[PDB]
Design a protein around this ligand. Sequence first.
Ligand SMILES: [Fe+3]
Ligand SMILES: [Fe+3]
Lengths: 332, 332
Amino acid sequence: KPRIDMHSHFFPRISEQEAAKFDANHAPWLQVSAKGDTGSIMMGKNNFRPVYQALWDPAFRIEEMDAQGVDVQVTCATPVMFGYTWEANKAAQWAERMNDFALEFAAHNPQRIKVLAQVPLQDLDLACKEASRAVAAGHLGIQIGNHLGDKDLDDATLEAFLTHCANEDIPILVHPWDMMGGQRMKKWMLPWLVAMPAETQLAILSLILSGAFERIPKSLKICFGYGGGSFAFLLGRVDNAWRHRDIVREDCPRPPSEYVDRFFVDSAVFNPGALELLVSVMGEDRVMLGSDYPFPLGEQKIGGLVLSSNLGESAKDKIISGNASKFFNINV
Amino acid sequence: KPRIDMHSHFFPRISEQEAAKFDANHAPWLQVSAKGDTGSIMMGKNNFRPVYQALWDPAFRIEEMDAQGVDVQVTCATPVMFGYTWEANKAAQWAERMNDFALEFAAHNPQRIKVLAQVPLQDLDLACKEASRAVAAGHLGIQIGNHLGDKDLDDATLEAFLTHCANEDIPILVHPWDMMGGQRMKKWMLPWLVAMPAETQLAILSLILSGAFERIPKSLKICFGYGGGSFAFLLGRVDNAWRHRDIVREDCPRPPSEYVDRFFVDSAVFNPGALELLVSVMGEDRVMLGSDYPFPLGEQKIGGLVLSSNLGESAKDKIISGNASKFFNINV
Ligand SMILES: [Fe+3]
Ligand SMILES: [Fe+3]
């Protein structure tokens, strides 16, 4: 039964001078070492993130895919690539480049590497153009940040985007980015451990409590990275809020727990017990295998947590294969 | 078999005339209505927060305890009473009276209503003796906000504040306030559902990943509110990042999950699976029973979630009674 990892990232071959053509210092580019096994993602003239070959080089990535026993990998842009804050034409031009770079990457092996597209999400019209064009060009769906500055997914622009994709049977993966906190989580990767889960939970709850799921067609295929943050665990607090205060219930007609059937989440939660609570809340039909490859905080043995757990026979195949197969309509 | 609820709040009988002796601009005061069953917390002249009798009336509170099954109850100040932004000598006096009004509330019935004190935490020195006075005065411990502005618990002054408390054996309850978010979480009580649990997790992670537990004595008795937020669910992700990045690891010599035997959490998690995970992570000797009385979002039937769960009879006694009895020094 072919293992599918749906959460993985790539970054293309962009030079410093090319990035500068979009933005002096907000546009990302890749610095590769001369040997070319290691390198670093660069913000203007500034070190952003240390990385290795599997991120840019498809040939290298394929061996590591064999090594982990991963047949098909659905990879997407690095959240830093989004450029949601720039001028729309510059960001729309950017997204066409990146999504093409992505097809170029997967040309190496169409059968085993699948790509998701990015969109200039600050401008609804250019975003809908890109979403459609890129799926036409071969992408299996779209990856978007969880918020545009102070605009959460409850915002009419982000709804109208999701409504678009639902109507065109385009699947969406939502990745947290540009985390809250300001000047509080500077040390020990706290952004990744505190805010990122809260960001994702806020994404989920923005749709639930705003009554977004009532307005959006039930045919939308939407997924949340990293086990939907800390949603599942705090769900009971949400339901309690919903029942005992009216301002929590105004725009939401059903108990918030009833909306678990309207979205998906991936398996990356790094704990046996958290995974078992996840499947208790989400159901075996709504969890997919994501690893966050090939970043240091991604599950280093892909499928490790799932394959070693004590869940259904059917359920295990579902999470590692069955669910991701329908969701992205990959040829099984 | 004595039920102890250790997470509850009060507000005192403060006339604006006694409020103005400190401030008529930020210093909050109590407005008792017609009947005398609804009241209001006023911010000098305007309406901050409306509440019902149970918050300010001890006599009424006793009766609702009697109806609820609660035999002993530990109550602490409401977050708006903290004024950690105020001048160190203003707050040192303001806090002294707030803990006096506290003790006046507890005076009615000391056997059953116990009190915890607030401090001018923005000044270590002023806050330190204030704790000692209040404990010598009748309070069983102290209550602090999780963070002071951009200063989290990884801060030396705070760490020293906790070290003062460990030394002089004063137990602490940490309560999230003034939530992160900026201009984002506006409708549906999102600050209280997303930000709040994230604050508490951060407070816990701040001590663990900084290595603060390597310096603070094992004798510190410190509790985190609301089940430690999303800590227990996300602990696996923190262990995984520790294992895979050197910056996460640098100031924390043991794995993060090792430190769960250094603090306590309350049981306000509103979900039976969340609770069993919480106990699985922390242990039955480290969980205490909290309701967050009398706020609407606090548990309706105090203890309901514990008593209707799959835990050891032995285990339910420790949560309901045992642990709170050792932790606070309450004659059963
Ligand atoms: Fe990722
Ligand atoms: Fe509280």
